Design a protein around this motif. Structure first.
Motif, PDB file in Angstrom:
ATOM      1  N   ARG A   1     -25.007  18.678  11.113  1.00 55.21           N
ATOM      2  CA  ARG A   1     -25.271  19.316  13.385  1.00 55.21           C
ATOM      3  C   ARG A   1     -26.629  18.209  13.433  1.00 55.21           C
ATOM      4  O   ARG A   1     -26.937  18.400  15.014  1.00 55.21           O
ATOM      5  CB  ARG A   1     -26.345  20.607  12.936  1.00 55.21           C
TER       6      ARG A   1
ATOM      7  N   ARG B   1     -26.505  16.419  16.478  1.00 54.98           N
ATOM      8  CA  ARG B   1     -27.257  17.015  18.288  1.00 54.98           C
ATOM      9  C   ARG B   1     -28.561  15.842  18.422  1.00 54.98           C
ATOM     10  O   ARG B   1     -28.705  14.972  20.079  1.00 54.98           O
ATOM     11  CB  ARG B   1     -28.084  17.922  17.753  1.00 54.98           C
TER      12      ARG B   1
ATOM     13  N   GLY C   1     -24.846  12.186  19.343  1.00 59.32           N
ATOM     14  CA  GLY C   1     -24.536  12.810  20.657  1.00 59.32           C
ATOM     15  C   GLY C   1     -22.890  12.166  20.832  1.00 59.32           C
ATOM     16  O   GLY C   1     -22.743  12.170  21.260  1.00 59.32           O
TER      17      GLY C   1
ATOM     18  N   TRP D   1     -19.617  17.556  18.522  1.00 56.11           N
ATOM     19  CA  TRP D   1     -20.442  18.383  19.565  1.00 56.11           C
ATOM     20  C   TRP D   1     -21.536  18.662  19.890  1.00 56.11           C
ATOM     21  O   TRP D   1     -21.824  16.986  20.118  1.00 56.11           O
ATOM     22  CB  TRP D   1     -21.008  19.313  17.718  1.00 56.11           C
ATOM     23  N   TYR D   2     -22.283  19.070  20.799  1.00 57.83           N
ATOM     24  CA  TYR D   2     -23.595  19.100  22.011  1.00 57.83           C
ATOM     25  C   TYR D   2     -23.413  17.847  22.489  1.00 57.83           C
ATOM     26  O   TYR D   2     -24.061  16.892  23.075  1.00 57.83           O
ATOM     27  CB  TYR D   2     -24.817  18.627  20.906  1.00 57.83           C
TER      28      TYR D   2
ATOM     29  N   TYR E   1     -22.344  17.246  26.447  1.00 57.98           N
ATOM     30  CA  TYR E   1     -22.594  18.322  27.494  1.00 57.98           C
ATOM     31  C   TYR E   1     -22.335  17.114  28.644  1.00 57.98           C
ATOM     32  O   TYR E   1     -21.907  15.883  28.761  1.00 57.98           O
ATOM     33  CB  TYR E   1     -24.437  17.696  27.996  1.00 57.98           C
TER      34      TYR E   1
END
Ligand SMILES: CCCCCCCCCCCCCCCCC[C@@H](O)O[C@H](CO[C@H](O)CCCCCCCCCCCCCCC)COP(=O)(O)OCC[N+](C)(C)C
Lengths: 57, 70
Positions: free
Chosen positions: B38, B42, B45, B49-50, B52
């Protein structure tokens, strides 16, 4: 970043059309009928190059 | 008699403890791994996950625009 390239003042000299907008409007239809080919070549070059400096000739 | 009727042998509890310990150890190492994963996603990128949203490029109009220079 970088140096912009510009054509010289001699490169921008041409025999200029010195008639007013009324004369141009009066002639416009026959002018478009007669001078279609160079005009179309210029406008195609103009939307394809996206650059005034590539279209002077 | 009490041992025969109420209880079981030592092997049962021994091997049950072995299985329980395995399960808990794998859960612990998975928890550490997930925390690190994780953190990496984060920060960088590049993972699933994460993620945007950015502007969809299918919205852009590619046509002549009344002026040669866009
Ligand atoms: C001289 C005698 C000396 C010894 C005295 C013995 C006293 C026995 C009563 C005390 C019992 C202590 C509590 C035990 C509770 C847990 C027992 C439980 O584990 O056994 C289950 C069975 O439970 C018993 O049926 C509970 C008995 C409850 C009654 C105890 C005696 C007193 C009852 C009084 C009732 C009175 C009613 C009213 C009368 C008028 C089955 O176990 P299970 O998980 O399969 O085990 C797997 C291993 N195996 C296969 C080898 C067995």
């Amino acid at each position: 970043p970088g140096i912009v390239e510009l054509p010289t003042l001699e490169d921008l000299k041409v025999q200029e059309v010195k008639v007013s907008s009324s004369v141009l409007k009066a002639a416009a239809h026959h002018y478009g009928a007669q001078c279609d080919k160079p005009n179309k070549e210029f406008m195609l070059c103009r939307w394809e190059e996206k650059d005034p400096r590539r279209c002077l000739e | 008699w009490i041992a025969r009727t109420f209880y079981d042998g030592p092997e049962k509890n021994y091997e049950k403890t072995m299985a329980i310990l395995q399960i808990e150890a794998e859960k612990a190492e998975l928890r550490l791994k997930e925390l690190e994963v994780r953190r990496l996603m984060r920060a960088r990128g590049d993972g699933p996950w994460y993620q945007y949203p950015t502007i969809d490029k299918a919205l852009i109009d590619h046509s002549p625009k009344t002026t040669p220079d866009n």
